[PDB]
Write a protein that binds this ligand. Structure first.
Ligand SMILES: O=C(O)CCCCCOc1ccccc1CN(C(=O)c1ccc(-c2ccccc2)cc1)C1CC1
Ligand SMILES: CCCCCCCO[C@@H]1O[C@H](CO)[C@@H](O)[C@H](O)[C@H]1O
Ligand SMILES: CCCCCCCO[C@@H]1O[C@H](CO)[C@@H](O)[C@H](O)[C@H]1O
Length: 267
């Protein structure tokens, strides 16, 4: 009965995921393996791509131009905000989330979206770079390394996490549950109805446990491995937030999007 009810639960969350995210891991890995994106690996190809690739965010809508490293940061920032939007619609497509009072919904999103973003980011990452512009471009890890501090520093740790997370070989059906577990997290500060969020979280984690038994029958220790990845993401986001505070302090000409400011306001 428990195993049965949780199967239906997991399907409803997978459907919310397919409905709301712009790219699946299945799509992204098929592009990344060739089963072609324009490669951005230096200033000239960055320029050609801004001339020749279709970006969700028209380049004129980015903040005013400053320099190459900041331009790259602005595109990272636009994508981050776009993914907050998708995560919000994903969360709202989950009935037990939509039943929480709107203020707790905000609290969960505030402290959860970056963790979820960096987990999902892995889907479009390999050891050599990552997909951009809805898969029509590929930016190399080496080029991102070449940007000036503090912008190269805030990027490289995400690759390190991603290459390790991708070795677990989750598919989209696993990720939908994993992400749901990250957002529906009863530990976040200032939650109003904690026992309710704890109850939902535990349901998701039991559903995820059974899902991996069925979907990855020969993978050992995969559930506890993923719990530890949830702990790892928390530390990745702590470090991210600290790097953002230094960018705010030392790079005063760099615009920071007000929604992300609201997230960092008191972490
Ligand atoms: O959190 C904030 O306050 C926003 C600030 C985040 C800053 C750190 O963003 C990073 C870091 C590591 C890996 C990926 C991202 C950003 N990102 C992206 O999808 C992304 C988008 C565009 C590019 C790009 C690079 C060169 C040329 C053209 C485009 C690269 C990456 C994932 C959403 C998270
Ligand atoms: C059900 C809709 C009506 C909700 C009204 C309650 C709003 O409370 C506010 O929730 C915010 C988190 O979202 C906190 O940042 C604020 O400190 C808090 O004051
Ligand atoms: C769009 C979903 C993600 C939203 C993330 C941003 C949340 O910001 C918070 O909004 C609250 C009022 O709602 C304020 O009380 C807090 O001061 C502020 O930190």
């Amino acid at each position: 009965p428990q195993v049965a009810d949780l199967k239906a639960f997991s399907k409803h969350i997978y459907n919310a995921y397919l409905k709301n995210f712009n790219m699946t891991k299945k799509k992204a890995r098929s592009i990344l393996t060739g089963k072609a994106p324009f490669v951005i690996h230096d200033i000239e190809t960055l320029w050609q791509a801004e001339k020749g690739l279709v970006w969700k965010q028209l380049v004129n809508g980015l903040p005013p131009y400053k320099e190459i490293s900041v331009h790259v940061f602005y595109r990272c920032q636009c994508t981050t905000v776009e993914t907050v939007r998708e995560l919000t619609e994903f969360a709202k497509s989950i009935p037990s989330f939509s039943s929480l009072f709107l203020n707790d919904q905000v609290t969960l999103l505030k402290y959860g979206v970056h963790e979820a973003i960096f987990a999902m980011l892995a889907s479009i990452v390999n050891k050599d770079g990552l997909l951009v512009a809805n898969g029509s471009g590929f930016v190399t890890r080496e080029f991102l390394r070449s940007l000036r501090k503090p912008f190269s520093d805030i990027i490289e740790p995400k690759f390190e996490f991603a290459v390790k997370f991708n070795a677990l070989e989750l598919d989209d059906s696993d990720l939908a549950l994993f992400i749901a577990a990250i957002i529906l997290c009863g530990d976040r500060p200032g939650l109003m109805n904690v026992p309710r969020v704890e109850a939902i979280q535990d349901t998701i984690l039991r559903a995820l446990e059974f899902h991996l038994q069925a979907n990855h029958p020969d993978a050992q220790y995969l559930f506890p491995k993923l719990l530890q990845k949830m702990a790892d993401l928390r530390q990745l986001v702590t470090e991210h937030a600290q790097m953002m505070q230094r960018i705010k302090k030392t790079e005063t000409e760099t615009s920071l999007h007000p929604l992300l400011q609201e997230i960092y306001k008191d972490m």
